[PDB]
């Protein structure tokens, strides 16, 4: 937690310790900022020549980096994964709340589990069930009959609408809204008529959602986020989207209604995905991808024309917009020859 | 809960089947069980009727022969679906009565049947019309006015001097009336331009979640009647949007854009400012709207996905398209 001996840490990390196991480790730090008591890690062998500069008490590395160590070393197979683990062990991140704040407004019919914390000025509606060890940050709203599973945590100012289901060990950052009305309207002769959105959102276990993201409820059936999904900030997940287990959605992705995404996918930042279609398992879309069509085969998919100096881009834009006339001039030339 | 005959009458539907069937809610065709009414638009689902467990199905005269249950025959099933879903709506209200934890300034004016959620904050000079509902944790800034029948969900922020019309609905996380992005440049330093215009939202405007509508610089940002705006949109200062226009999710509008009536702006489109889009324009998803649009119709931009290997080539050839033009022309000169 606060401090740990190097040998004990190495044991917990299943790492091979080279150096003094009695060394007291107080936290993790970058290579450039590490000082005495800090452990850091190295993945890229280029950093080998910079270990002399690094002031950490210990460095996590592979067997081949060992002859270059300028400190006690923890030898493992995957330094990056080990870093995730040790950073969890030495985490300084506070909790969103501790105990039940006096200023929280909690309906009488709400069911609270053991060791639930609710932050100041949070609002819990009727019929709400909070599992054991749930933590609700300051100023959150949890709407009627919603369920939040054991160990799940909401940071400050998260809004959960009504009839939402959140599994266990989920984490939601501030500003996020789960279960707002989907964008459902019928067009009556130019006027928009609201379609009540009476489906729900079902979020699985171990789901991590970023800040200022919106996940709309379904129109009739549900919006569903499978287990182990990670979603970054500023994402829009429209009504009745289904996201398969372990899929990653980077920042600012816009998904339209009724999109189904498979398992183990990776959707790159600011991609825009068409609705009423499917993306199979193990697909990667790169940043700013314009996902117009279904994707039935796994692999990496991309779109977009990268930056050019303004003067150059003007020409490119003007020529591409005129590409049908270039395609015409070529067919005629091909005829001549 | 409602009798099928009574529901059919409110829907202006021709009832074919038992008027005494009790309807408890709406459901999808595939999820529908006894007590549920569902609907059908696409004729391809006709075959699916034989496995549907709904007590009643909303359909058209042409679909009626294929029906395996009580049927409500109408001219427009999707629209009827919207109406029946409204009748059978189970959505709660953002608040009921005035919460003791709500902080309401003494000079705030409340009409009849106003409800304000827990920990909401109502500033001085605010006017809330009849039947207005303010959800939990909302802020409504100084001298702002919200018209009869309008509703804000939890954690909506309305700045000062904002006008919202009647029967509006705004989802959580949305911010209306923040400062527009106004700065003057003084030798590389940005000097703030105070934004003292307002936002005027008309009647029956529906705004999604985490949407930002900036106040005007001097004149106002204006959202016309019956406009629908989805989530994550950015509406910059002095944007004017015409009546009945639809703005899909994640659209970015720049300052002083003027949009006409009955437009459809597709998701993640990016629209240049200080220009006009005329009535009845459709911009499809991810549209790069750089230039004024003076004629009605459907407009588009963008090159869709390709396998990464293919894209790499495509992208490189496009960035070198000017050379590809020169060589096409010299080859014409030659022959």
């Amino acid at each position: 937690h606060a401090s740990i001996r190097l040998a004990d840490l190495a044991q917990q990390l299943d790492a091979e310790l080279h150096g003094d196991g009695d060394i007291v480790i107080t936290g993790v730090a970058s290579m450039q900022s590490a000082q005495t008591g800090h452990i850091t890690f190295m993945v890229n062998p280029k950093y080998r020549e910079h270990l002399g500069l690094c002031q950490a008490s210990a460095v996590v590395m592979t067997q081949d980096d060992l002859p270059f160590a300028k400190s006690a070393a923890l030898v493992v197979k995957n330094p990056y994964l080990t870093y995730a683990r040790m950073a969890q062990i030495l985490d300084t991140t506070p909790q969103p709340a501790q105990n039940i704040a006096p200023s929280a407004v909690i309906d009488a019919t709400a069911k609270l589990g053991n060791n639930v914390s609710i932050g100041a000025n949070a609002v819990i509606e009727s019929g709400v069930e909070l599992g054991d060890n749930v933590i609700i940050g300051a100023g959150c709203f949890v709407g009627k009959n919603s369920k939040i599973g054991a160990g799940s945590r909401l940071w400050a100012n998260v809004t959960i609408y009504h009839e939402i289901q959140i599994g266990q060990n989920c984490l939601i950052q501030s500003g996020t809204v789960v279960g707002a009305d989907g964008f459902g309207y019928a067009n009556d002769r130019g006027n928009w008529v609201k379609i009540p959105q009476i489906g729900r959102v079902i979020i699985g276990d171990r789901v991590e959602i970023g800040a200022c993201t919106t996940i709309d409820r379904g129109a009739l059936d549900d919006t569903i986020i499978g287990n182990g999904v990670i979603i970054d900030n500023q994402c829009q997940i429209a009504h009745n989207v289904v996201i398969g287990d372990n899929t990653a959605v980077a920042g600012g992705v816009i998904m339209a209604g009724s999109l189904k995404i498979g398992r183990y996918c990776m959707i790159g930042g600011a991609s825009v995905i068409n609705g009423h279609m499917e993306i199979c398992d193990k697909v990667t879309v790169t940043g700013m991808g314009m996902v117009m069509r279904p994707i039935t085969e796994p692999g990496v998919y991309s779109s977009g024309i990268p930056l050019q100096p303004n003067k150059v881009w003007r020409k490119t834009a003007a020529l591409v917009m005129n590409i049908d006339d270039m395609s015409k001039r070529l067919k005629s030339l091909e005829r001549k020859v | 809960s409602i009798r099928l005959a009574d529901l059919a009458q409110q829907l202006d539907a021709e009832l074919h089947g038992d008027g005494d069937i009790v309807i408890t809610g709406v459901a999808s065709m595939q999820s529908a069980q006894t007590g549920h009414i569902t609907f059908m638009v696409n004729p391809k689902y006709r075959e699916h009727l034989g496995l549907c467990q709904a007590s009643a199905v909303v359909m058209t005269q042409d679909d009626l022969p294929f029906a395996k249950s009580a049927a409500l025959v109408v001219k427009n099933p999707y629209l009827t679906y919207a109406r029946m879903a409204q009748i059978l709506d189970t959505t709660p209200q953002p608040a009921q009565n005035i919460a003791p934890s709500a902080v309401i300034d003494a000079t705030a004016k409340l009409g009849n049947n106003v409800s304000i959620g827990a920990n909401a904050v109502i500033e001085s000079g605010v006017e809330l019309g009849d039947n207005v509902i303010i959800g939990a944790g909302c802020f409504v800034g100084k001298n702002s006015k919200i018209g009869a029948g309008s509703r804000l969900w939890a954690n909506v922020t309305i700045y000062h001097e904002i006008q919202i019309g009647q029967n509006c609905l705004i989802q959580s996380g949305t911010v209306v009336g923040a400062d527009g992005f106004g700065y003057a440049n003084d030798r590389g330093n940005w000097v703030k331009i105070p934004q003292i215009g307002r936002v005027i939202i008309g009647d029956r405007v529906e705004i999604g979640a985490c949407t930002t509508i900036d106040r005007g610089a001097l004149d106002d940002t204006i959202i016309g009647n019956g406009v629908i705006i989805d989530n994550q949109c950015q509406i910059a200062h002095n944007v004017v949007i015409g009546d009945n226009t639809a703005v899909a999710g994640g659209v970015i509008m720049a300052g002083s854009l003027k949009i006409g009536r009955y437009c459809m702006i597709g998701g993640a489109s990016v629209i240049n400012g200080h220009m006009e889009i005329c009535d009845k324009v459709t911009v499809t998803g991810m549209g790069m709207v750089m230039r004024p649009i003076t004629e009605p119709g459907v407009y588009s931009s963008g090159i869709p996905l390709q396998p990464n290997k293919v894209w790499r080539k495509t992208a490189a050839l496009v960035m070198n398209i000017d050379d590809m033009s020169k060589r096409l022309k010299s080859l014409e000169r030659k022959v």
């Binding site: 303004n310 003007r314 020409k315 834009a317 003007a318 005129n322 | 750089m290 230039r291």
Partner: peptide, 10 residues
């Protein structure tokens, strides 16, 4: 505009 003069030369 940004594309007008290029297009004119064309």
């Amino acid at each position: 505009d940004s594309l007008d003069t290029v297009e004119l030369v064309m």
